[model samples]
Target: KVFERCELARTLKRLGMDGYRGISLANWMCLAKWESGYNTRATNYNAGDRSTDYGIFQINSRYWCNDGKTPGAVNACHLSCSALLQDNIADAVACAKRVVRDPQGIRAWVAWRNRCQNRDVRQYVQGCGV
Candidate 1:
C-alpha cells in the first residue's frame, strides 16, 4: 500500500487536525513519518483479515466495524469498506489529538513520535507499532 505524505496530510487535515495542536507543520509531517512512514497505503507486513480500522491509531477493524461504529453495517468483518460499516479515521485522529502532544495523534501516537524524535528507526518502534 505505501501511502504518501500528501495523503496522510490530507487525511489528517480533513479530520480538523492541525498537527501538534496546530503548532507546526513539521510536527504533523513527523507524525505521518512515524506512523506509516508517511505510507498511506501501508498495510501490516503480517496482514490480518480486517485492517482498515488500523490506520494511524492502528485501531482494530473489528472494534469499529463489527462493533457498529459506522452507519452502514459490514456484512461480515472482512477487509472491505463502503461508505458505511466503518470507523472514520478522520474523527479518531481529531479526537486523539486532545491528549497526544509531540507529533501528536493523542496519547500513544505522541509517545511514538518522541521515541523516534532523534533516534534510529528501530528504536522508534521499540515498544509500539499499533
Candidate 2:
C-alpha cells in the first residue's frame, strides 16, 4: 500500500524513529518523498550501473540488500531486496537504520543529498508532531 506522507511521519514517530541517528523527522520525510513518494513497492534499477534502489528510502543493492539480479551486490543488510517492496515497513525501517549508522549517515541516500540536504523540509512534518 502506498502511504500518505503524514501517515509515514506519524508512524515513524510512533516507532521512535523520527530522529533516528540524528536525522530529523522532517528530513527523513523529505528523503522518503523524493525516494519513493511513500510507496513501499517502489523499485528502480539504474541502467547505467545495474544497481537497484528499493523501497521507501531507495536503499541501494551495491552495499545493502541483494535482489539477486544486481551483480556484485553485497547484501549488507542480510535481506532480499524484494523484501523491502511491501506494505509493512518494519524491515525497511530496520534496514534504513543500519544505513544511517553507516559512515555516510543520511548522506547514504543520494536523493537526500541532491534534494533534501541543507534544505528546509519543515513542511514535511508540519502536522504529524514528529
Candidate 3:
C-alpha cells in the first residue's frame, strides 16, 4: 500500500511516531519518504549482507526481524519480516521504536542521515496538519 504524504504523516502521528525518541514527526516523515516513499510493501535486498530491508520504514532483516534467511540474525524486534510488509503499520511502527532505542537513535537508518539530517525537514509535515 502506497500512502499519500499527508496520510502517512497522520498515521505516524497517531502511532506515536511524533516526538518518539526525540525525533519529530517531520523527521519521521522525511525518513519514510526517502526510505520507502511511504510504500508499505517496499523491500530492498542487500546482496553483500544477504539481508533485506522491509516496509515503509525499511526495517532490516539483519537484526530487527526474522526472515529465516539472514544468517546470524538476532530478531531483536521478535516479529517476522512479513509483519513489516503489512498495510497496517502498527507493527512496523513498534519495530521502528525499538530500533531507535539503540545508541544510534534514528541514525540507524542511513537514508535518514543522507536525506533528512540537518535539512529543513519541516516541509514534510508543513501542510499535513500533523
**Which one wins on lDDT?**
3
lDDT, candidate 2, 1-130, per-residue tens:
7898789998887766866888888988988999999999898989998998899889998889988888888888999988899888988988998888887999977888899988888999997656
- How well does model 2 score by local distance difference test? 0.87
Question: Residue 92 error for model 1, in Å?
Answer: 3.3
Q: Taking the tens digit of each residue's C-alpha lDDT, what string does model 1 give over 18-128?
A: 545643444555655665565334444214443444444443344232334444444233333232223345444543453354342333454355754554443222332
lDDT of each: 0.43, 0.87, 0.95
- Per-prediction count of colliding residue pairs? 7, 0, 0
Each model's Cα RMSD:
9.5, 1.1, 0.6
In model 2, which residue pairs have backbone atoms overlapping below 3 Å?
Answer: none
Report the C-alpha displacement of residue 83, candidate 2, in angstroms: 1.3
Report the poorest 10 consecutive residues by lDDT, candidate 2.
11-20
Q: Can you write out model 3's per-residue Cα lDDT over 1-130, one digit (the tens) per residue? A: 9999999999999999999999999999999999999899999999999999999999999999999999989999999999999999999999999999999999999998899898998899988887
Comparing 1 and 2 on lDDT, the stronger one: 2
